[PDB]
């Protein structure tokens, strides 16, 4: 995250980090004890991946960390149906052993299609992650978070040569300087509804980071809400 601030331990209890061939390569959100929702472009190779919930400082030990192995990865059935477009950039991860929910490990709420879209239209959400905070910089050791305003669709289209589909939305400031970035993918764009946060987006892509006139592009969760609930049912 560029231009954001340090989160406080337990501020975003639903946030998780993904470790694998590369450490802290993407973020994710807890759907429930056995499931994590993230971005499909983060887990195409299906290679071995690890999930750390209750994470805050990736180079220290808080004794709140819960590590789990990923035994199943379900990217959206239409992700990459059209090569390199990032459309349908969402994926689900099943854990080997269930997470034990507590103050640092809490799921994120997921409303129905209509309400998820209503919360998104509130126009203000938070993005978080251990992605880059500076130009060509490495992972942030401490979780970062930033509040980003929603962007009208027409402004979104005019900001990039790439196609922005109805399965995506823009967020960022006119001036730039504040944006989610490399390493933050899979992370949640959340909308705070009277003390209760709901998943309204998946950090997905952009052109460089924080550039003025450019905006972060996010996967529109409302469109995948039914798919998420159907696949993450506890039995």
């Amino acid at each position: 995250v560029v231009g954001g601030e340090d989160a406080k331990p337990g501020q975003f209890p639903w946030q998780v980090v993904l470790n694998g061939k590369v450490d802290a390569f993407c973020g994710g959100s807890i759907v429930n004890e056995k499931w994590i929702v993230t971005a499909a472009h983060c887990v195409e190779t299906g290679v071995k991946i690890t999930v750390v919930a209750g994470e805050h400082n990736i180079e220290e030990t808080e004794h709140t960390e819960q590590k789990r192995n990923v035994i199943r990865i379900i990217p959206h059935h239409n992700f990459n149906a059209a090569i390199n477009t990032y459309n349908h950039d969402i994926a689900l991860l099943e854990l080997d052993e269930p997470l034990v929910l507590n103050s640092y490990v809490t799921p994120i709420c997921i409303a129905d299609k209509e309400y998820t879209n209503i919360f998104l239209k509130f126009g203000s959400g938070y993005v978080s992650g251990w992605g880059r905070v500076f130009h060509k910089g490495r992972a942030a050791l401490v979780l970062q978070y930033l509040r980003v305003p929603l962007v009208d669709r027409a402004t979104c289209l005019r900001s990039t040569k790439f196609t922005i589909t109805n399965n995506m939305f823009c967020a960022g400031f006119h001036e730039g300087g504040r944006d989610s970035c490399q390493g933050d993918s899979g992370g949640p764009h959340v909308t705070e509804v009277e003390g209760t946060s709901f998943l309204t987006g998946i950090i997905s892509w952009g052109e460089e980071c924080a550039m003025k006139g450019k905006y972060g592009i996010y996967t529109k969760v409302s469109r995948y809400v039914n798919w998420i609930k159907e696949k993450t049912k506890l039995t």
Partner: protein, 59 residues
Amino acid sequence: TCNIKNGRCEQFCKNSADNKVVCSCTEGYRLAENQKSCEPAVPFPCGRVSVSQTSKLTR
């Protein structure tokens, strides 16, 4: 009635017969007494910060 202020529903609102409002909440929650607010029905309900940095306030 959902029309204005989500019809006094803390979370979700739906329109019942006779312009009546029927509130609802998400998993891990229950319709608070007033039939509007939503209250935790589990130790750790989705979307909420319960850590509150140990204790550094009135509490």
